[PDB]
Paper text:
By analyzing these unclassified NR sequences from emerging model organisms, we could define a new subfamily that we named NR7. Through a detailed structural, functional, and evolutionary analysis of the NR7 from the cephalochordate amphioxus (Branchiostoma lanceolatum), we established that NR7 is a constitutive transcriptional activator that dimerizes with RXR in a DNA-dependent manner.
To this end, the NR7 LBD was expressed in E. coli, purified to homogeneity and crystallized in P3212 space group. One molecule of the NR7 LBD is found in the asymmetric unit of the crystal, suggesting that the NR7 LBD behaves as a monomer. The overall structure of the NR7 LBD contains 10 α-helices arranged in a three-layered antiparallel helical sandwich with the canonical fold of NR LBDs. Noticeable differences compared to other NR LBDs are as follows: (i) the bending of helix H6 towards the interior of the receptor accompanied by the shortening of the adjacent helix H3, which is almost two turns shorter at its N-terminal end compared to what is seen in the structures of RXR or ERR LBDs and, more remarkably, (ii) the collapse of the central part of the region normally attributed to helices H10 and H11 (in orange in Fig. 3B). In particular, helix 10 is shortened to a two-turn helical portion (called H10’). At the C-terminal end of this short helical region is helix H12, which is located in the coactivator binding site of the LBD, hence suggesting that in the crystal, NR7 is in an inactive or repressed conformation. In particular, the large side chain of the aromatic residue Trp276 in the loop connecting H6 to H7 (L6-7) is inserted into the pocket and occupies a significant fraction of the cavity, leaving no space for the binding of a putative ligand (pocket size of 112 Å3 as calculated with CASTp, smaller than the pocket of the orphan receptor ERRα LBD).
Residue numbers in the entry: 158 to 389
The structure:
């Protein structure tokens, strides 16, 4: 792609790590919004949510400095960023499908249909605000890819042991982002503007029940056991 021409070495690797993959339902499973899942099975929002959790972990391992960190620092970064990463990935792929929510291949729902599947007016409001920022920022493919790595390398992550290393790793990503926006658009200010406009659901605890869909994600799949398995 023409975009990688304005990236540095780290920037090319982060674009090639593909944080833009989209979750899918199992092969041959048709989705019909009118035909309820209710009673032994889980709905498509959760199926896609769990598929995406696995994809986020798979992406994180391709991020240069991640595997060098000790297992508990990798576990801390993922736990802290899962909500922000899911929100960023979802909002970005929704942009051509607006006003609908594009949860995954074969699943595009209006905001009203999301409510019947697990979401509440509170989670709808958060997604609305997150899409609005990406639209304002006018984020391109490269910028989205780099933003995923910036969200991952969060130095204030709870239970993080090697804070200076994550700070330096975030620094390396910041350098790739300013390098890119300067080389392609020749606007020194663009990197700082997108970084200041980006919502961060960690400033105020995401446990505020406005976007506590992570409790359903952590409860059903027992995320701690799966993360250890995937990072081993
Ligand atoms: Cl995909
Ligand atoms: Cl430097």
């Amino acid at each position: 792609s023409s975009d990688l021409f304005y990236c540095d070495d780290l920037g090319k690797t982060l674009v090639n790590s593909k944080p833009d993959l989209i979750p899918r339902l199992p092969d041959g499973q048709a989705f019909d919004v009118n035909v309820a899942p209710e009673p032994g099975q889980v709905n498509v929002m959760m199926q896609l949510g769990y598929d995406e959790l696995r994809m986020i972990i798979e992406w994180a391992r391709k991020v240069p400095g991640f595997n060098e960190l000790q297992m508990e620092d990798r576990m801390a970064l993922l736990k802290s960023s899962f909500m922000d990463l899911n929100c960023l990935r979802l909002s970005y792929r929704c942009l051509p499908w607006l006003p609908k929510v594009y949860f995954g291949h074969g699943v595009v729902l209006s905001v009203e249909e999301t409510a019947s599947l697990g979401w509440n007016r509170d989670m709808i409001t958060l997604w609305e605000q997150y899409v609005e920022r990406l639209q304002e920022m006018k984020v391109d493919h490269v910028e989205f890819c780099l933003l995923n790595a910036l969200v991952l390398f969060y130095p204030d992550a709870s239970g993080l042991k090697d804070k200076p290393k994550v700070t330096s790793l975030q620094g390396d990503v910041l350098k790739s982002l300013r390098h890119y926006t300067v080389s392609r658009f020749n606007d020194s200010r663009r990197h700082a503007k997108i970084l200041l406009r980006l919502p961060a659901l960690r400033t105020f605890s995401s446990k505020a029940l406005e976007s506590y869909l992570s409790m359903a994600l952590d409860g059903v799949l027992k995320v701690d056991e799966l993360v250890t398995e995937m990072l081993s």
